[model samples]
Target: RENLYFQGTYNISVVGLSGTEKEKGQCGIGKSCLCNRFVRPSADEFHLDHTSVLSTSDFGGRVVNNDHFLYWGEVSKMHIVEQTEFIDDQTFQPHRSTALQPYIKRAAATKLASAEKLMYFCTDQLGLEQDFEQKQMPDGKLLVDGFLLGIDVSRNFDDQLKFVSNLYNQLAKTKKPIVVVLTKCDEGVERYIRDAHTFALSKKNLQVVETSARSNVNVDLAFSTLVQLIDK
Candidate 1:
């Protein structure tokens, strides 16, 4: 199957670092940050290539706020580190708090004049609807057009169903169709996960599919499905 591409502007944020021990240490364990370094692409020297991973010199990592909170002490002794803090309100106001002021400042500095095309990859299953819908930029603008929802639910069936149902309900309000992608299926988890998804579909009239992007399994299918949905 031919892969279908979703072309939309992306706000690329480098959050974490992955490199050799020496390279990571140079960026400062908890203070500074580094992003992937890439040679200038022939088409656009200013913009980064989607498939390339660039290295950075700074280690001041980006903080991701989600349901779970991560502390600085857990990782290193440095006072400044990337962390996640949970907020009670579903809608987040970035400029309202000093804690998030840095992120807001960065967003403002990197505001795009022209939209750039990007590929949306769904990695984890939870918060697909909320991540795409509830999370907004500092200016109260939507992040992306849509995304592919990826999840692995064999380990915890009931919880996954509840999450999917919640996501479906949210998407129903937005009138956006979600493309479900299931991963980690080689261990016979596909059967149980599919069964649970079948129940969810019966209840909500939604379809969840199994895929393995790592092994080049169903990747094309997933992309194709995304293209078809976008066309509609």
Candidate 2:
């Protein structure tokens, strides 16, 4: 009953460890660089709320860089959350407490599968070295739309294509709308992530959008498309 009634509101979340920036020879994407893409605070309906604690929240244990709702037609916006850490290939798990929980705590102290969730899975243009490396992802209502695969185009080639296809079958099933945000497009494989044909594939809930986040290429549109995707 409530599910149908409250369908208009969304709690958009971005899950997944920050992919490594190998060129810099470091680890995961910076916390601000990724979340801020969808978190610009406007004077009107949009606001960014940085939270006090993230350990117990439903954002898969990412940095609790919280924000208020970004209102669109259906009170549409994202309550996006994320973390800044590299994936641990040694254990093939989220490093640290990398507890990527996704359920939104409901009014009754109950839980719901995270409906408005999106994953910011990181890949390299250097032939796909990393992957969706979280050991803890939610199921059922705590699930997500799909990953916004941010590929670093300046890095890889045909060899990297295997990594994208290699996503755990679990990810494919637990999610819906798969989006591709070609991160370094300003610079790749010169391929998918932002490609329309590739965006809508067998099971992505598919959509594609390009972004520089530096030059502001389709940055807003990328976020816009995500928020409006499920609504329409």
Candidate 3:
């Protein structure tokens, strides 16, 4: 027999456009709602009331430490971590209680330099330990390992394409894996998907998945695909 340790961590960035007044509560394809739904689907309010106001401050990371990344020693033995990138007004603006100032105020250089609006957060998952004495590791890298580009199908095809292309070109340099998330796939909503699939298919290593955070459609599958890509 031999001692062993297994660990896999991927910093994921969630980026998309900003919603307008006419669209009501849908902000940039519901980035905040998507993240909230994925983690706590059963929350009382599926829709975030704070959407109107600038909420997520600089680098709006959900969990400061890796406390969110843990598993009971019953069925699974692996720990998983996912970091979310929240952009401010130009991206996700900084706004929070004074207590969280230190962690929230430290803006990453990579994010500031980018002209596009983007946000950042982290989910650190870890493997099981015999004694459960492992200490939390340092923060993840400034740059993300992967990206989830959220596209609102309800928007115009041309405009969405332009945003996607602009964001894609900016992120393409990293050579990191990217998954296109077509959000707001719920019923009764006017959608424009005419050539969206065709564009994604043409790009090598680029993948696309449809999601309706409200309907909980393909929510998990989208993340699973991204993790798989990062694994590869």
- Clash count, candidate 2: 19
lDDT of 3 by residue, 66-168 (tens): 1111111111211122222222344333233233222212211133212221122212211112223333332332245577777777645576577667667
Which window of ten consecutive residues has the lowest lDDT sum in model 2?
65-74
lDDT values for all models:
0.32, 0.38, 0.48
Per residue, candidate 2 scores C-alpha lDDT tens digits across 102-201 of 2111111122343333333322101221343332222323323333544444443333334444432323454444455555456633554433235346
Backbone collisions counted per model: 12, 19, 23
- TM values, all candidates: 0.41, 0.49, 0.58
| Highest TM-score against the true fold, candidate | 3
- Candidate 1 TM-score to native: 0.41
Descending-TM-score candidate ranking: 3, 2, 1
Alpha carbon deviation, residue 51, candidate 1 (Å): 20
Query: Where is model 3 more than 4 Å wrong at Cα?
Result: 1-7, 19-27, 55-143, 188-191
lDDT of 1 at 147: 33
Better of 2 and 3 by TM-score: 3
Q: What's the lDDT for candidate 1?
A: 0.32
